[PDB]
């Protein structure tokens, strides 16, 4: 009974941190891909010359 309450404490904590880890990596992905998309576009300006 006690163990379940500690598990009930642990499960949101594990969910909170790991989802935040995943979320930051997606935020990292969004920042990376935004720059990376722009630089090909920049390369196309160079290619246009």
């Amino acid at each position: 009974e006690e163990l379940k309450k500690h598990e009930d404490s642990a499960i949101p904590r594990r969910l909170e941190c790991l989802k935040e880890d995943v979320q930051r990596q997606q935020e990292r992905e969004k920042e990376l891909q935004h720059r990376y998309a722009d630089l090909l576009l920049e390369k196309e300006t160079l290619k246009s010359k």
């Binding site: 379940k4 969910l15 790991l18 990376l32 990376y36 630089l39």
Partner: protein
């Protein structure tokens, strides 16, 4: 898997270091609460492991005073009294055996049944309890694996996302080197 890991778990416990202000100051018991001094003397007696102060067997059998006492009428009187008491003890005993032969047979059967009834109630409560514990275990198991699936699913995504990101970072470097070179070649031209 965990068998090997459990011995690896042990490692840091081997490296615990002098800090033993351990939590057992919480809710210290009391030895003393309702001890009488007589009970305390008995607990002193058992701490000293003292043998039994035997209740006298000689009263069962005493045929006469001792040789110096034998010249006292009152000493013989106490032994005559003693012999009188023992006969009545046998009288009360034989009286008890009369009842015990007829009724005690039935009463033993009734009492042995009552022990079975205590066991039947105990086994019912045990089977209630064992079921309830295993019902709890099924609540434990379902909760762990439901959460454990979704995290593992997320972790698989996370591993894929992490790997792909640095791959994109690698290609980012590939872009920047190539863009720079084209900028040099166009700039020199």
């Amino acid at each position: 898997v965990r068998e090997a890991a459990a011995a690896l778990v042990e490692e840091e416990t081997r490296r615990y270091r002098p800090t033993k202000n351990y939590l057992s100051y919480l809710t210290a018991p009391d030895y003393s609460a309702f001890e009488t001094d007589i009970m305390r003397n008995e607990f002193e007696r058992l701490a000293a492991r003292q043998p039994i102060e035997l209740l006298s067997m000689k009263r069962y059998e005493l045929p006469a005073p001792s040789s110096g006492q034998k010249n006292d009428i009152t000493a013989w009187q106490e032994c005559v009294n003693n012999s009188m008491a023992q006969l009545e003890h046998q009288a009360v005993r034989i009286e008890n055996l009369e009842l015990m032969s007829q009724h005690g047979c039935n009463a033993w059967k009734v009492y042995n049944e009552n022990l079975v009834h205590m066991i039947e109630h105990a086994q019912k409560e045990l089977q209630k309890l064992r079921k309830h514990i295993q019902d709890l275990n099924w609540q434990r198991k379902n909760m762990q694996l439901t959460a454990g699936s979704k995290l593992r699913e997320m972790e698989s995504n996370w591993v894929s996302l992490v790997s792909k990101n640095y791959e994109i970072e690698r290609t980012i470097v590939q872009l920047e080197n190539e863009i720079y070179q084209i900028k040099q070649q166009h700039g020199e031209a």
